[PDB]
């Protein structure tokens, strides 16, 4: 067969150890899920430094904790805008997920609180910025470089899926690079606990699985489709399905056809054809052998999964960092004020936060 006795024994034991790890990780997650933390700091404990990103119901600021001098990324959500835009459940769920997970590639939530106007989530600051910017700037990643990142998403999805969490918003814009060159996943607005199926139309057009487009009940296999899109975009510099308008992107996604740059290795194309598989009974990550079909694929043959998990692999790329609080890897935004009302807004809606 493909493996001699020694390699087969090693792979079998590795796979059993992963099961053992996931069982313990699911136990630790559920404890924290059932009994979450609340109100662990206050606004005047931090100095505001710079806006790192803005949205329709809040923003993310680099802040410095006064006592400890540590820098953090503080997500500020306007309670009234959250309600107007129908994001109550998503916002509470994101916080609940973040306070319960624990994994080396998931951002760590260090504090959360609220006041009359806003909700606050204080997370580790990830100074390397989004993978998106580095990818557009470099053009494309070589296959070893893309594989380094892909390996981290594989392990992170293996973790999340063992907790019955579907991520649903994978894309380079949602992947930050830390000071050691490793990935941090920070946003969980669309993640859901789904043991079986779910139905919401959500995601980003280029990364939508065909069964989401076709309004089907779907499961965690949408994340493995999205991994195929991510790997393609990292290695090509552009995604596999694009067009002027989303409807034309969706026709491409459902067609079952995909084209590859001539510089893609045959191993990479074979993996991508198995992730970007419109037929759910044939998609890698959705078969009897689960995540192992992906991890044991030829394109990952040089990947030491434990070494990646332990962050012992030398990263292909370390972002420029001139010191703590360096923000050169983030876009520049106009600094708007953080007004806090004399009157509590939306207290009932955000009671559990």
């Amino acid at each position: 067969g493909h493996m001699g006795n020694a390699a087969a024994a090693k792979k079998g034991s590795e796979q059993e150890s992963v099961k053992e790890f996931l069982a313990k990780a699911k136990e630790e997650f559920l404890k924290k899920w059932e009994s979450p933390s609340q109100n662990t700091a206050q606004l005047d404990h931090f100095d505001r430094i710079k806006t790192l990103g803005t949205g329709s119901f809040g923003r993310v600021m680099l802040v410095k904790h006064k006592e400890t001098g540590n820098h953090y990324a503080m997500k500020i959500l306007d309670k009234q805008k959250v309600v107007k835009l129908k994001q109550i459940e998503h916002t509470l769920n994101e916080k609940r997920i973040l306070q319960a997970v624990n994994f080396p590639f998931l951002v760590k939530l260090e504090f959360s609180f609220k006041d009359n106007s806003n909700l606050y989530m204080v997370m580790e600051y990830v100074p390397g910025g989004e993978m998106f910017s580095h990818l557009r700037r470099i053009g494309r990643f070589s296959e070893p470089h893309a594989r380094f990142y892909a390996a981290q998403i594989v392990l992170t999805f293996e973790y999340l899926h063992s907790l019955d969490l579907i991520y649903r918003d994978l894309k380079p814009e949602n992947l930050l690079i830390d000071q050691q060159g490793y990935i941090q996943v920070t946003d969980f607005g669309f993640a859901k606990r789904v043991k079986g199926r779910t139905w919401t139309l959500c995601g980003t057009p280029e990364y939508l699985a065909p069964e989401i487009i076709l309004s089907k009940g779907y499961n965690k296999a949408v994340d493995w489709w999205a991994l195929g899109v991510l790997i393609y975009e990292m290695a090509a510099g552009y995604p596999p399905f694009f067009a002027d308008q989303p409807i034309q992107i969706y026709e491409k996604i459902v067609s079952g056809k995909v084209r590859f740059p001539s510089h893609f290795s045959s191993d990479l194309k074979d993996l991508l054809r198995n992730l970007l598989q419109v037929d759910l009974t044939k998609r890698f990550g959705n078969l009897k052998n689960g995540v192992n079909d992906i991890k044991n694929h030829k394109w990952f043959a040089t990947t030491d999964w434990i070494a990646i998990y332990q962050r012992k692999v030398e990263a292909p790329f370390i972002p420029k960092f001139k010191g703590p609080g360096d923000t050169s890897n983030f876009d520049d935004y106009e600094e708007e004020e953080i007004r806090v009302s004399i009157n509590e807004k939306c207290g009932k809606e955000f009671t559990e936060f």
């Binding site: 989004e130 998106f132 557009r136 918003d169 894309k171 814009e173 607005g189 669309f190 139309l201 959500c202 995601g203 980003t204 057009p205 280029e206 939508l208 510099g237 552009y238 694009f242 067009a243 002027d244 989303p246 084209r259 740059p261």
Partner: peptide
């Protein structure tokens, strides 16, 4: 080229969720 087609799509910038 496919790259030129990608530029022509207008979707080279940061993409938001639907």
């Amino acid at each position: 080229t496919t790259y030129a087609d990608f530029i022509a799509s207008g979707r080279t910038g940061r993409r938001s969720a639907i």
